[PDB]
Symmetry: C2
């Protein structure tokens, strides 16, 4: 069975393993070279203003030159996306489902996703009847019990609002 | 068909989607809460000196307190792992298959993994017959054509050294 990439239903490889053009995880030219779909591709995948605004897979940083990677060259000055070293403001959605904290910064973890979380992958944003009709952000689904999320548990049976199925 | 985690061959979800305790991708308490395996867990997965050296999945930063996330609270002062904002020295292999550049910093992309790459996910590191019996770093496999890597193409048939067959 395929492991990753379009052959593997969009899954990523663990530990920055490259997803080959054939949808398997590994390192070396056969995986990280021509056709590499994700992970530590070499060269790095094209991103940002050099890929129609597509972000790097695996939370890699998008360099000023529009290549995916890590290190000061990628995350530092000129960084376009991913975990840049610069604080990322929001209010305006965060990229890649990052939580917009009550303070208006993007991140993950309770400080961002917990109390006061405005959008993105909030821990427990209420919605639906339980929240008097409140809507979810990010086009998430409101589950049966009145929490915002994605996946079958929220978009499937009982789904109240959002892109239910 | 499981998607992720221990049920899904250790696969990650894309775009920070949480892998539920049951091996499916999504957001909300069912995925990100109790039992969350990877992605934007809430709270963040335990990591670092507080979790037996475990690194964060999906290249999340490990906070001073040993939780996985993004933002200055996680990647900034006291960051233990992942794409911390501080340059990351190596010589001490880089965590999670990051390339140790010729200059002794961890990263991904050609500047790190290309010419002069010492270890990690180097673009092209020769080995075996084709390189005078030179061994691969990181316990990678030496392919039949004398390139260092992982996955079937390197660890399968023709494998010269490392965790072959
Ligand atoms: C939870 C949160 O949003 N914390 C942010 C922090 O990430 C950011 O670095 C700082 C910028 O001054 O503002 C804090 O409030
Ligand atoms: C490819 C490489 O290692 N580049 C490093 C850079 O990541 C680091 O931030 C800088 C610190 O002075 O030194 C450079 O040589
Ligand atoms: C370069 C490539 O994708 N080749 C794959 C390899 O990655 C995978 O590990 C193997 C199954 O074990 O099947 C090969 O065809």
């Amino acid at each position: 069975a395929y492991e990753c990439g379009k052959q593997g239903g969009g899954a990523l490889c663990p530990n920055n393993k490259c997803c080959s053009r054939y949808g398997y995880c590994g390192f070396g030219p056969a995986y990280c070279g021509t056709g590499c779909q994700s992970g530590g591709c070499c060269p790095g995948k094209r991103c940002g203003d050099q890929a129609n605004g597509e972000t790097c897979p695996n939370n890699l940083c998008c360099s000023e030159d529009g290549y995916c990677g890590f290190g000061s060259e990628y995350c530092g000055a000129g960084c376009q996306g991913g975990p840049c070293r610069a604080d990322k403001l929001c209010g305006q959605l965060c990229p890649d489902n990052l939580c917009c904290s009550q303070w208006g910064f993007c991140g993950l973890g309770v400080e961002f996703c917990g109390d006061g979380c405005q959008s993105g992958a909030c821990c427990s944003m209420r919605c639906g009847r339980q929240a008097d009709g409140a809507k979810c952000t990010n086009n998430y689904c409101c589950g049966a019990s009145g929490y915002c999320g994605l996946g079958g548990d929220y978009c499937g049976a009982g789904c109240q609002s959002g892109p239910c199925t």
